[PDB]
Amino acid sequence: LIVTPSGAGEQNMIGMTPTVIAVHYLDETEQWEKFGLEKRQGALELIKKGYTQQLAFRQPSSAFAAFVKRAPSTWLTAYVVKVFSLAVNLIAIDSQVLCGAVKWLILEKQKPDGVFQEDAPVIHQEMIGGLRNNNEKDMALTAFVLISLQEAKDICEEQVNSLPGSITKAGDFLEANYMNLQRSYTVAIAGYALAQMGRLKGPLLNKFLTTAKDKNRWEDPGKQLYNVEATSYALLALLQLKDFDFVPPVVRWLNEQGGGYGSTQATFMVFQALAQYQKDAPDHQELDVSLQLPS
């Protein structure tokens, strides 16, 4: 077939993504009844397999790369943190693994002004969604990594005393440069990261809200998938703000839009966003998990 790289430490995470986020979605919306509760247990074992397999790509630093002889990726390590965080009450996640990865990010990859830097890009660039785009990478990657740190905060605050300060520093950098942002993608991902901290207010909030088109989506010219991802981030930001009036058209647009090549991020983010929408929003609209959780 086609010649393509085989970075298994990345490819296992691509494989793990649908099962984890599907289980997340069904747990959060409490919809296992319709889907079939008997299926949950097998999904849990599949997640456990993915997790256990990922451990072999955990390097002595606690960071992750596609290959054990390749330098660890900042993005991949943060993605692992985010995925493993969603799984902590689904299976036994070793805290040293999760919190070790968090601490490496903080002690090695964060720059003095709060920015997170990638020194060894993932080989499978399709798995990183909108991030693949060149510009505003310092803001976009810092937001991505900060979001992962936010997911690990409660689990790891006790193991990693430096965590809250790293979060605040990354938050400082996002806030200081948000107004100069031009891409809708960055506006949405950084908007979510800031909103989670209660730091998306004033002119920043205005920019975020007014960056949308037709008050229903955040999009930039290019791959449609990146807009589905951006808009899911924006939906999550709206839910942090509890701005339930702006919400309905966004959810309609998202639902009117899942898998294949380059769909890791879209799949993860859509299911996360729509899951939280149904969990939070009073009298939510009616909204297929079968594709993520086959047989």
Added chain:
Amino acid sequence: GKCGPPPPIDNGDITSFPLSVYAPASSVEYQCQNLYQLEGNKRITCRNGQWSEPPKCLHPCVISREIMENYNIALRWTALYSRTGESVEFVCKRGYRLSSRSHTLRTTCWDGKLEYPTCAKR
């Protein structure tokens, strides 16, 4: 005489996973964030239920783009952050002359403090 969890430091952390309780004469070490400089003994020791003093993390300097501009200077050997203790070299922008003291084009970053030279139109 047991100790309890080692103390936090700004811009750094211990190199081990923390314990709930720490035996007498046990030790842990600290590491600073990237580009920060450890000042003091990086190791602390438990004894008589108390920890010895933890190190400090000296700030790097974040080279202003641009206070460099309103001082009419740029970086020589162009390629920024510099570590505590590193020297950084500047040049006057074209058509300008050094208006600060004779030596001020080479300066040393220390704990977040950097003294910029200034130039003025000739």
